[PDB]
Amino acid sequence: SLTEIEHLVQSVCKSYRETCQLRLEDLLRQRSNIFSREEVTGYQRKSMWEMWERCAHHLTEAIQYVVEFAKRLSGFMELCQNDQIVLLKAGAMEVVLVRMCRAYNADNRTVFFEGKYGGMELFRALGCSELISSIFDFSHSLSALHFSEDEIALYTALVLINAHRPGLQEKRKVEQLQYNLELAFHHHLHKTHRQSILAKLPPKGKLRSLCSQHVERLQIFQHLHPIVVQAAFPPLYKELFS
Numbered sequence: 001s002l003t004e005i006e007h008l009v010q011s012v013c014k015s016y017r018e019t020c021q022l023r024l025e026d027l028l029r030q031r032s033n034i035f036s037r038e039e040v041t042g043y044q045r046k047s048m049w050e051m052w053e054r055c056a057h058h059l060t061e062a063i064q065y066v067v068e069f070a071k072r073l074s075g076f077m078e079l080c081q082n083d084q085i086v087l088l089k090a091g092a093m094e095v096v097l098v099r100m101c102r103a104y105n106a107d108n109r110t111v112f113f114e115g116k117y118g119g120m121e122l123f124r125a126l127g128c129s130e131l132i133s134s135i136f137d138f139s140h141s142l143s144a145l146h147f148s149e150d151e152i153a154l155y156t157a158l159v160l161i162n163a164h165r166p167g168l169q170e171k172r173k174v175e176q177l178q179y180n181l182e183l184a185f186h187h188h189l190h191k192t193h194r195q196s197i198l199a200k201l202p203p204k205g206k207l208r209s210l211c212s213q214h215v216e217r218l219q220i221f222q223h224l225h226p227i228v229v230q231a232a233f234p235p236l237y238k239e240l241f242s
């Protein structure tokens with residue numbers, strides 16, 4: 001049934017639109033709005049721990065939007081809670097990292113952060129320059145594809161719905177969702193004459209390794225300087241915080 005796959009594309013893109021935080025038109029319109037040298041120095045002089053508090057708050061919010069995205073994916077709520085948590089634990093921050101490329105400007109290597117665009121030197125006080133550089137580099141590689149909003153929506157749905165995640169109890173049910181999302185993505189790329197991006201997408205293991213380094217650093221900061229989380233998803237919170 002072709003209309004079932006067309007309906008799936010529509011529903012995935014709708015969930016993405018309802019959870020994507022900033023509209024692409026707003027991000028693009030703000031590209032000329034760049035932090036001044038005075039404003040960059042103000043961020044660099046902030047305590048590591050204040051920048052950590054700010055970034056942790058932004059990342060928690062971003063994860064929560066990804067959870068809402070997943071909750072609206074067809075069939076996700078029909079998975080058992082164990083498998084929902086397995087998939088979100090493994091993939092929600094990977095989706096956050098992919099979503100960042102929308103807010104990245106490859107021409108001056110800046111990201112939209114707290115209302116204006118700034119380079120990675122904005123984050124100097126965190127003392128994480130290698131991680132920050134890796135995140136910027138990863139956003140650069142995606143942004144060069146000119147990833148469309150529907151491409152991000154369908155691709156990030158597949159980042160989440162991955163039947164190979166260790167620990168799933170109902171692997172056949174996740175497989176069925178994955179196959180339908182794969183078909184939705186590939187059908188959409190053919191319709192829009194964008195199958196050329198398939199060979200240019202991040203290779204196997206690159207997003208995994210970047211996310212692993214990223215979450216490891218967040219866990220170190222949270223151990224040294226715990227933040228208060230506006231916790232909305234107790235089963236997921238319990239897996240990440242201790």
Ligand SMILES: O=C(O)c1ccc(/N=C/c2c(-c3c(Cl)cccc3C(F)(F)F)noc2-c2cc[nH]c2)cc1
Pocket residue numbers: 056057059060061063064088089090091092093215218219222227229230231232233234236237240241
């Ligand atoms: O509302 C809720 O219940 C809820 C629950 C969990 C949330 N995020 C957990 C985080 C964090 C993280 C962040 Cl975002 C900030 C500070 C410290 C961390 C730390 F690393 F300590 F966990 N990093 O990766 C994840 C993650 C989530 C799914 N897969 C990976 C957010 C909101």
